[PDB]
Amino acid sequence: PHILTIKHKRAVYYPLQLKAVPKPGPPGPGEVLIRMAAAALNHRDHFIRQHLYPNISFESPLFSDACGTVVEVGPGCKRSDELLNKLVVLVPYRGWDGDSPDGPEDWSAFATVGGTEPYRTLGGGQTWMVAAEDQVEVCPPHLSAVEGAALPSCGVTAWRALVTKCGRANVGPGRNILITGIGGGVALQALQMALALGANVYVTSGSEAKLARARQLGAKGGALYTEQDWPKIIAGLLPLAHPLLDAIVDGAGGDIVIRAVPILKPGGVIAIYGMTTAPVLDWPMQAVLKNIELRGTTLGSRAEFRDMVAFVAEHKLRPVISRTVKGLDCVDAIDGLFEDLKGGKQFGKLVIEI
Template sequence: MKAVVLEKTEGTPGQVYYPLKATDLPIPTPAPTEVVIKILAAALNHKDLFCRQHLYPGVDFDIPLFGDGVGIVVAAGTPTLERQWKGKKVVLVPGRGWTSDPNGPETGNYATLGGTRFLPNEGTLQEYVAYPAEDIEDAPLHLTNTEAAALPLCGLTAYRATITKGHVTAGQNVLVTGIGGGVALNAMQFAAARGATVFVTSSSEEKLSKAKELGASAGVNYKVSDWEKQLAKLLPKSRPYLDAVIDGAGGEIVNKTSGLLKHGGIIVSYGMTLGPQAPFTIKALLKNIEMRGSTMGSRKEFADMVDLVRNKQIHPVISHVVNGLNNVDELFEIMKRGENFGKLVVTVSDEGDQAKL
């Protein structure tokens, strides 16, 4: 079967950009606790770009890339698992080693799927993958293959940031920054599904308009130096403050938003696209603002996220789709140019959406 891995070349972390390499691997046979999944579609995450730049821990040149995917179960390690799963369309939990503790992984060995040595042989950029049966969920029936492939990693990260750490509830005002991003769009959808009023930022007027079509109340362009002042004018008179900020960019986010947040407001930081720091300020401290780090999430949060998506009939936003494992490079180029609004997906099998079971 075909798979896509990284090709090792000379270069230092941050300077290097490893090419993609197609490789042939044997179709896996399942261990007694596993199923074999025929991948239908897979999706790119920022982490995969970091792997190519050697800025992600544990980069491995033999492990297929990508942690997002949807597929059909074609085999199982025991007759019981076969009866339970064979023929079902499933999404893969994109991390391992974290059951349910809201504070973080119980094991200290949390590993994410795709491109690293921490989960050998696993990654969704291959035609078949053997996967623990306890780490799959039925794909929500209202989703197409590309939408289902787009959901796992960003959905999980957004769920933890918005619901577990952000405590977003009905009636609140929430700011989601960088709305073109996959996590940000899910965060906007989840906050809106909770009944919050959502404000967004973006580098592009077009993306701000699209976000409003998808449920954002209003937005401002973060390229404008005083965007926080513009945002202040957009807050409703009846509730002229933010309850929470869900941020994946870092940089000056505390400085920019502490004047907008209520006393005791929450800034959830799930990423630092702009660099490895986001300084806390005395102004934020004096308002009792809490800054909370947030990562992907537990197995339980994954199941809860899939339930929310199913119950509220939420559709992940798809930016671009390419067909076939040979065309994945194009997705990386789109992400590097910042052109995406939502997720970048590759269809791996030509079974298409007829495979929706």
């Protein structure tokens, strides 16, 4: 019965602390007890380690991705027979319900769990977890604990960025979707989802090895953003019957807007979920004239999460996994997965078997 948190140090990097804590008690009313099986590391957790993320905590278990087996259900559980002795996935947030799709109703109530305040009971870096029967969803029956762990926070982000940010009309048969920086956690998730939705999915990478792996997964074409004319290369791959891109799922920022306007249809959506390059963009006047909308997105509503797992459970989508450390005890191995995150040279998710 352990828990994995960061500890104080003094441009910083907090070391990992393995604390032995008592086993959680019986589940309260409407709560379920979860035997943790696997926790996936996410890109957000790297900024927590350098304090570049708001509301970090030296007491909350880390990782926003948790997958475990519900062992005990509490009194008054309406999803009891649905969750008992089954693998479930935690929603990686609270304070965002399905009745407000545009965003959380109260920004002061919304918080991202995992290594942050105030929800110190929710997190993947722990052997046990007690949580509400509404905060978990039934893990797709075809995924292992490692695969289920790699889904929640990067799946609902990609799911929302397609069906709501881009628009279901833009992720269908005959539509052209560019997904920049294939190999990242979020870009891979949408690569599968946009293909299963029926789009003509094209990708962008920095290495020729990552490009080929993307074509192995179903990418109808790709380019290299290291090439000074990558919009024109992607432009050439588009069919004659529809020579333009419908929407873009970018998570790098940079010059994406000024590069993509000439190859994007009027009314094209640039659904941005991250800005790794620079914390600012470049909005040209040609994006205004083309009625182009840069739609920022992050995670998703509670209904969009439930919608997400059901879509993955139906078409049997599986996430690519890069590495996997067998043991929350091995803190040096878990630390190794952090250096591999910073390097940005990866393809798939980095998970930890609990």
